[PDB]
Amino acid sequence: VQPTPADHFTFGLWTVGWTGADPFGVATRKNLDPVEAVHKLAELGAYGITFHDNDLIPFDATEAEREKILGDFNQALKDTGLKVPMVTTNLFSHPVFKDGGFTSNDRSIRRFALAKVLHNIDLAAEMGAETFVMWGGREGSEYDGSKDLAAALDRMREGVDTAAGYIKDKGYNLRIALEPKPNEPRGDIFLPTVGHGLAFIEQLEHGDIVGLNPETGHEQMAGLNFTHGIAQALWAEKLFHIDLNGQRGIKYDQDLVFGHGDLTSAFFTVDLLENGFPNGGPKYTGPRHFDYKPSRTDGYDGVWDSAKANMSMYLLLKERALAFRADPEVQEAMKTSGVFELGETTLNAGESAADLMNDSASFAGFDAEAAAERNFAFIRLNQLAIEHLLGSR
Amino acid sequence: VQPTPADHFTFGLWTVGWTGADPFGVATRKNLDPVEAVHKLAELGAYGITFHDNDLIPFDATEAEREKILGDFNQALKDTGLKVPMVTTNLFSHPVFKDGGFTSNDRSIRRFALAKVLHNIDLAAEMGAETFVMWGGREGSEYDGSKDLAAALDRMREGVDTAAGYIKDKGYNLRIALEPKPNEPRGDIFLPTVGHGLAFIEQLEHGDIVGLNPETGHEQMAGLNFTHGIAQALWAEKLFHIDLNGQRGIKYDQDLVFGHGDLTSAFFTVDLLENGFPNGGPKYTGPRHFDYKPSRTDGYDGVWDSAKANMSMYLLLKERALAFRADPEVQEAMKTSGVFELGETTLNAGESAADLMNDSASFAGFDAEAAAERNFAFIRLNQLAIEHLLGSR
Amino acid sequence: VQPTPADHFTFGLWTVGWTGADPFGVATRKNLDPVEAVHKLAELGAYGITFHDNDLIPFDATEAEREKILGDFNQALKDTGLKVPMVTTNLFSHPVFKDGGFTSNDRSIRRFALAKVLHNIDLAAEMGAETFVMWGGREGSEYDGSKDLAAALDRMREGVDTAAGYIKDKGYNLRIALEPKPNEPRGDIFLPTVGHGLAFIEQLEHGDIVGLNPETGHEQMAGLNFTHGIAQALWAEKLFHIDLNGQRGIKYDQDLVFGHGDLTSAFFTVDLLENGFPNGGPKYTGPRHFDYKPSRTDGYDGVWDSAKANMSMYLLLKERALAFRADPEVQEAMKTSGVFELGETTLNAGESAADLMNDSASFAGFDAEAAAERNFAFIRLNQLAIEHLLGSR
Amino acid sequence: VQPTPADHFTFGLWTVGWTGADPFGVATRKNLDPVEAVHKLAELGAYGITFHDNDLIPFDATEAEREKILGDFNQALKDTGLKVPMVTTNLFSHPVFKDGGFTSNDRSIRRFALAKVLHNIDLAAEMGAETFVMWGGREGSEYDGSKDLAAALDRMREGVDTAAGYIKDKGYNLRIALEPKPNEPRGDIFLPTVGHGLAFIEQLEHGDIVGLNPETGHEQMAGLNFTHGIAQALWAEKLFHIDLNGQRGIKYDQDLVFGHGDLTSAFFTVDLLENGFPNGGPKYTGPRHFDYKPSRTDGYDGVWDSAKANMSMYLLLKERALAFRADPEVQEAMKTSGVFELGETTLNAGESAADLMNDSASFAGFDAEAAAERNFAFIRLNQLAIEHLLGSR
Numbered sequence A, B, C, D: 001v002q003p004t005p006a007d008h009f010t011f012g013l014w015t016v017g018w019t020g021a022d023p024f025g026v027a028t029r030k031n032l033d034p035v036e037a038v039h040k041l042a043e044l045g046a047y048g049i050t051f052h053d054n055d056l057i058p059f060d061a062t063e064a065e066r067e068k069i070l071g072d073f074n075q076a077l078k079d080t081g082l083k084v085p086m087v088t089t090n091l092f093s094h095p096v097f098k099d100g101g102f103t104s105n106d107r108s109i110r111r112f113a114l115a116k117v118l119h120n121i122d123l124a125a126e127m128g129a130e131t132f133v134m135w136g137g138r139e140g141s142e143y144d145g146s147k148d149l150a151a152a153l154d155r156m157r158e159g160v161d162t163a164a165g166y167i168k169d170k171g172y173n174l175r176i177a178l179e180p181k182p183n184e185p186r187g188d189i190f191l192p193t194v195g196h197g198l199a200f201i202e203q204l205e206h207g208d209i210v211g212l213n214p215e216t217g218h219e220q221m222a223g224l225n226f227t228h229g230i231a232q233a234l235w236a237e238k239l240f241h242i243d244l245n246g247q248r249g250i251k252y253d254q255d256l257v258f259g260h261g262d263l264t265s266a267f268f269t270v271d272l273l274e275n276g277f278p279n280g281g282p283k284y285t286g287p288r289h290f291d292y293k294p295s296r297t298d299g300y301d302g303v304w305d306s307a308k309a310n311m312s313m314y315l316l317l318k319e320r321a322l323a324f325r326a327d328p329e330v331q332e333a334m335k336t337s338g339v340f341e342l343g344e345t346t347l348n349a350g351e352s353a354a355d356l357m358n359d360s361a362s363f364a365g366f367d368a369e370a371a372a373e374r375n376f377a378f379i380r381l382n383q384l385a386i387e388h389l390l391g392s393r
């Protein structure tokens, strides 16, 4: 398994550039020059790079400095061929965002945060990005009385609709994607899961260009099924981007390499991305982006090893998932379990409610105890899946 | 604290009628006659009763028997004055529903399940219920390959839209409410949280009459903030009913008496229900329904004690929450923390995106480091809330 | 793969005999005869069968029925050659155990539970069991004021020490193993994890013959690392028996097939059980017991598929764990990461605390900045395990 | 309320000195001078102050700086009268501890970490501390193949036993206390719960002077009951010190003010610390230490508000716990539930296992169906605690 640009593997600058600072200790690695991240990622088979405005351009950069940096960064892109499919804003690091950007209690701070976002949209637009991601990191609270919850959602809506409205106004070919996270750094973050993100989108004036950016580990932080979460996003056609990584339980956001967390779950995510739905339906065609952090214990050879580990894991899973669905044995198991029967409408063509209620075969004389006898054989289907995954079939 | 019908305390028949059978042991209490539950609940101050079709009418009841039972149950209602505000269907107990009702893999079972629901709507309509609740208990899976996830959501939609369509067709003054649960009895249940329920509703043809029925313990089972979840439902105006209980962590569905789980959270739920949003907004005006189970260790005096404990806890919380918001000290704390400033729109009247981006006060010359100096004083606000709760103020 | 008796694969009667009654519904399968059970497991490659007293002998059974049942059961053992390596007592099913066996608040129930255990030691001894397991499923509470916590542990000690003294007094060749569980069916169960069980054993009079019986799923319900927990039990030489199964997350006890939960973790559990420690040390030599439940959606063909599935999963993982450790690249990766260096004592032979302190090379003139540069290469070592597990190397 | 030194309220320098740098952003407050800290806590009613070696003495400090810093610090102690009851070592901040102190894979780091601890015992002894706390924050791993689990525990034992032998050898009047944590910053930390710490202590050569230092929040991160866990440490006579704080759920370590997490649990923790056991037994007599962090959204007025808040919360709950137990209705409710009956031994004075077995009244002729009817009235007893806690009785 050798990744090629065709594979569409994208990495964030903050991923491989992650310094090692955690809540209990300082950085273990020296800062990484962005030019060098580009060159290194290009040599590994990456297709593109993504960043946060402050990952590239310092908060206090002068204009001459801003120009220099972009010149260097575009030079690296031009020399290597890397694309920049997504750009994002840092609304969490500076002490000004301690209560949030868009949902800060302070109105002057909310204004500043939306201005930071609008300028960042211009940047994204000039970099040629297709997606613009919003992670509301500091949006939430530690205490239930800190906020007016209907007012926090109005202020969130205001911000996203101003940003969406501006995109349309300028005619940029950009979509907004929201990234849910249940907690950390706040005790409770607003729009904590894929479901809440989807629900909020439907209340927006400019919801047509607003979608989701689910992250593996974040749904697993609420103990949810990541594959089910992204299936719901797909089904609603709001899967605009994805962040792949690993999480080993309900605890702090680990951001491990993709497949280094829940393996079986990783396996079914890849099947969903590659094979789509058994009965057909929408398919995700965007970048396969890794939002992970090289463990702080590892030094620079470890940083490039971990980058590579993401792409290897994905390709190894993909091979197995393709083999899995191609197996005649598996296709037979699927049939028996009623995976294909779930695809059939419950009602007959032009059958009404009333028609079903008096159909005696369906209710009045339906043999409930004979129907309960079906052996779904879901265990055998799971065993087959795991045998493909272990490459023993 | 003495509950009166005015309070709108509703109880399910299965709550006080819960027998004590769990996964590791048999029933510890004898079955409770429904007539006796009515009479007992009436004497305690209940406003009404709710039930599942099979809580009242056995699965295999003959027509003569069905008639008898309803006659007895309506007699009890007439004698005591209890209303029946909500009715629900059991799509989980019989062995036929082992893979679900609406999303079973077997099409004949899906047909039977929707027929069971349609007949149950007629029943609800003749009982004078305002709400009809759907809990998809067996809808989900243990294994990721068991289902076609886009097909499971199409089949879920079919069912709910047929039911919604039928309501409109018959002209019943009934609303449908979905109840989310993350897991148990399935490893993963579809529409696992308030957020996912809300998101699914927006894909329905008849979504105008479909809302939510969040249960305290169920959101706490994913480690979410129940108050935030219901605030999102309110804000979207989809809070059609609620099930109040307690949960002491991420573990099996406990269904403890309301306030016997997370107390501080219970306190802020009650404030939200009673006081509404600090800056104004929608208010929940339906029944305050308890979906709990008297612990299996307790015998019949314990059953009526626990019923009473629900209503006492609610009234005690309500007193404290009303006192809390009325306190001048608390109103001052709120002001300082910017609870009222969150209510102000971020943008000025007729201010555009572009207007904000060039306003130099808001970005270019905004003093980020002086703005970061604000002391939100959220700890002091929480301390005041807890002092009201402990009745020390 | 194909299992044989030399593999030491043991199953409980209650596993394959699990009929499907959960808290939300009735049984989906017919009762399994115990003689059928024995013949079927023996045909599958099993080495032994385990049981709870009431799995074989009904609570009500007269002395005549006891003897009839045992005689048929012993014949089947005889005909097949299956051993009975472990025996256990049901102290959780019957309503009398609603507040516990050994720690019930009621003194007369405590005496009855102890008598029940004493009788069961005699049947255990008589069957040839080497281990007697005690799972305190009803020992605990829902509310914190329910028990005197010091008195609960004294009563727990008293039961265990009487059971252990009785073995010693009779000279039975039996050991007691305690099975930890954090919750379910109690809100909080006493001795909730491997650590707490281990700690308790040290306060016993007859501690020398009391060890543990860890269960995969149970430590995973507190979000703990199962391999770390069994490592500590081994290390302390207290790993007397084991229950292997799967669990996906912190939720209700699932008891899935071993390998159908956390796959990566299952792999490293197999590596510690089969292979032991990289620097050498203790080894677990007992039965590989499976405590699982065949999913209720499946029929009897699924029950027998699932028993096979436990054994295949373990053998597949065993193969992979062997290949992984045998790999020269892995051994070299292990060396780089300091795996073997951890095995060297910190102090030199004869060195004292005072010698280490004043050694200027270990403290005063130690270059902490230089030592921090070490690449431990833990991501790379984890990637090599995963590739071995995917059968990619 | 108002706290006084007789209350034994102790705070760590790192608590009020916590500047706000989290994993997603920089400090929001200015550094706190340690002399300012002492004066301010002494003005608040505190009895003592605790610290980590690097909280006072920088890692880099020369011998001259060490002495200057200590002299100013000792003066402040002198001027205020605050004691220094506990001292601890930072083995987690500096990059050299990226794989642990005592269990680092690197032998030279292990020696450096032990020397660092030995030097710190000398400063502890010299300050008048009675307790020396050890929190192994970097001891553990992200991946299961990273460590030899038996070698990790031997190295952990070796460090602790050298530290304990050195105290004994010098005749310092000091005890070692281990602080358990399940994860963060490591994916899995060794000795993750109270049980595991307790179990480990029993494998030590110098176990007699080694106990535990439970922290509220940490046991709650594994979803465990904190009162049950401290009860077992007490019971074993290993509760040497304690850290009190708040945590809302299984997520990142929050370290909220004590009482701002799980309120009901906080109440029952206060009842065990102040009041002890209902049937009598052990009592914890040490300092009531608060290990928390003032929320980063608040300024210095919030820091001092939060220190006050810890002390008020504890005193408010203490009042309520006293009134609760003193209440004659509660005492009578306790009696009904068997709280005092649990305190009676199961066996009669002189009775043997063989006597209990053959007593026909305890087994053979016991009416299990009659005994099962007992109403334990645990819901009613929990309701009485809650009403006392709400200051309603």
Ligand SMILES: OC[C@@H]1N[C@H](CO)[C@@H](O)[C@@H]1O
Binding pocket: A012, A052, A088, A089, A133, A134, A135, A179, A213, A215, A243, A289, A291
């Ligand atoms: O890939 C997207 C980025 N990932 C970061 C953390 O999850 C966010 O700031 C943002 O959504």
Ligand SMILES: OC[C@@H]1N[C@H](CO)[C@@H](O)[C@@H]1O
Binding pocket: B012, B052, B088, B089, B133, B134, B135, B179, B213, B215, B243, B289, B291
């Ligand atoms: O109050 C509603 C009822 N509660 C039960 C369990 O939560 C469901 O069947 C249904 O939603």
Ligand SMILES: OC[C@@H]1N[C@H](CO)[C@@H](O)[C@@H]1O
Binding pocket: C012, C050, C088, C133, C134, C135, C179, C213, C215, C243, C289, C291
């Ligand atoms: O194999 C062990 C047995 N398994 C059951 C479930 O955990 C227990 O009763 C007992 O410990």
Ligand SMILES: OC[C@@H]1N[C@H](CO)[C@@H](O)[C@@H]1O
Binding pocket: D012, D050, D088, D133, D134, D135, D179, D213, D215, D243, D289, D291
């Ligand atoms: O008060 C105890 C201290 N608290 C810190 C955080 O848990 C530890 O380093 C140490 O155990």
Ligand SMILES: [Mn+2]
Binding pocket: A215, A217, A218, A253, A254, A255, A291
């Ligand atoms: Mn993340």
Ligand SMILES: [Mn+2]
Binding pocket: A179, A215, A243, A291
């Ligand atoms: Mn991300």
Ligand SMILES: [Mn+2]
Binding pocket: B215, B217, B218, B253, B254, B255, B291
């Ligand atoms: Mn529930």
Ligand SMILES: [Mn+2]
Binding pocket: B179, B215, B243, B291
């Ligand atoms: Mn409910």
Ligand SMILES: [Mn+2]
Binding pocket: C215, C217, C218, C253, C254, C255
């Ligand atoms: Mn189990």
Ligand SMILES: [Mn+2]
Binding pocket: C135, C179, C215, C243, C291
């Ligand atoms: Mn078990």
Ligand SMILES: [Mn+2]
Binding pocket: D215, D217, D218, D253, D254, D255
């Ligand atoms: Mn902590």
Ligand SMILES: [Mn+2]
Binding pocket: D135, D179, D215, D243, D291
């Ligand atoms: Mn601590």
